[PDB]
From a paper:
Upregulation of the methylcitrate cycle (MCC) is required to assimilate and detoxify propionyl-CoA, a cholesterol degradation product. The transcription of key genes prpC and prpD in MCC is activated by MtPrpR, a member of a family of prokaryotic transcription factors whose structures and modes of action have not been clearly defined. We show that MtPrpR has a novel overall structure and directly binds to CoA or short-chain acyl-CoA derivatives to form a homotetramer that covers the binding cavity and locks CoA tightly inside the protein. The regulation of this process involves a [4Fe4S] cluster located close to the CoA-binding cavity on a neighboring chain.
We then truncated a large portion of the C-terminal region (residues 441–486) containing the 447C-X2-C-X4-C455 iron-sulfur cluster-binding motif. In addition, residues 81–154, which were not visible in the MtPrpR81–486 structure due to flexibility, were also removed from the expression construct. However, CoA was also absent in the structure, even though 1 mM CoA was incubated with the protein during crystallization. The iron-free structure revealed a dramatic conformational change of the protein. The loop between β7 and β8 of the GAF-like domain flipped back nearly 180 degrees to be oriented towards the CoA-binding cavity and blocked the cavity entrance. A hydrophobic fragment of the loop with the amino acid sequence of 402GLGYLGP408 inserted into the cavity, interacting with Phe240, Phe336, Phe412, Trp232, His319 and Val414, all within van der Waals distances to the loop.
Numbering used by the authors: 153 to 354, 363 to 435
Write the structure that this text describes.
């Protein structure tokens, strides 16, 4: 299972890829980027630095979110995407073309990966870079602390979707500047579940599946995990639209869980309990 190999690859690295995370943040800062309208700014960077022309287009083959034309250096980006997802696509291609050697060197540190897993890892690392470019580490970490980890306000502040914020929160393991350690859980209506752990090594799946009963509303609960500790969980369905990295082909629920001992920093931790 290639996806299982890549899950271990990120697990072994605490879900944080330092060289790519730092490369994204340095490129964001050195190019004078500012949060807001990053899709236009990235298009300028792509032209200036690589001679790649970004164009917004419809009728992309297979309703893809992007199509790169390497022979004339044109990146087509789907018109139905919101600015945050347009930026995400462009930054993903920026990693593939401008961080290719770095990505290859990172993948190579896992001696066991199969070929299929190396290809999955390459795309995952380019996606990782895109998240770390749209949400540069120190700025995003500072914003998460000052907004008390409010996923919706973070999304509105940076112009990105709910699962994009959640995934980034689950990567904040930079040494000496960690965020709250989260378990990230994504599931579809049929129970197909992707779980990512930062601190643990393990499950009450209703902590995220419960979101499907109150669509587009945050669902919060406290549940014990297999270690005997209680976790505070926040979950929501993702709208099938132009924002967030999850495909609009079906509906997902996404959630974060943190040790109850970290939950006081969450805006979510005030409220009344019931069965
Ligand atoms: Ca391992
Ligand atoms: Ca969405
Ligand atoms: Cl992709
Ligand atoms: Cl997004
Ligand atoms: Na290194
Ligand atoms: Na870990």
């Amino acid at each position: 299972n290639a996806f299982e190999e890549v899950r271990d690859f990120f697990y072994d690295r605490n879900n944080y890829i330092h060289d790519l995370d730092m490369a994204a943040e340095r490129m964001f800062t050195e190019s004078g980027m500012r949060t807001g309208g990053l899709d236009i700014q990235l298009a300028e960077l792509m032209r200036d630095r690589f001679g790649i022309s970004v164009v917004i287009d419809d009728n992309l083959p297979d309703t893809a979110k992007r199509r790169y034309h390497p022979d004339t250096k044109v990146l087509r980006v789907a018109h139905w995407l919101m600015p945050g997802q347009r930026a995400f696509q462009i930054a993903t291609q920026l990693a593939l073309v401008g961080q290719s050697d770095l990505i290859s060197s990172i993948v190579a540190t896992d001696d066991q990966l199969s070929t299929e897993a190396r290809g999955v890892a390459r795309i995952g690392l380019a996606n990782y870079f895109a998240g770390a470019f749209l949400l540069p580490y120190r700025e995003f970490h500072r914003a998460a602390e000052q907004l008390r980890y409010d996923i919706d306000l973070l999304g509105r502040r940076f112009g990105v979707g709910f699962e994009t914020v959640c995934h980034r929160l689950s990567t904040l393991q930079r040494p000496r500047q960690r965020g709250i350690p989260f378990i990230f859980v994504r599931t579809d209506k049929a129970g197909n579940i992707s779980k990512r752990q930062s601190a643990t090594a393990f499950c009450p799946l209703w902590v995220v599946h419960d979101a499907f009963a109150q669509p587009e509303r945050i669902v919060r609960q406290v549940a014990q995990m297999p270690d005997g500790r209680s976790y505070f969980w926040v979950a929501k369905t993702t709208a099938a639209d132009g924002l967030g990295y999850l495909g609009p082909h079906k509906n997902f629920a996404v959630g974060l869980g943190c040790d109850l001992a970290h939950a006081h920093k969450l805006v979510y931790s005030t409220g009344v309990v019931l069965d």
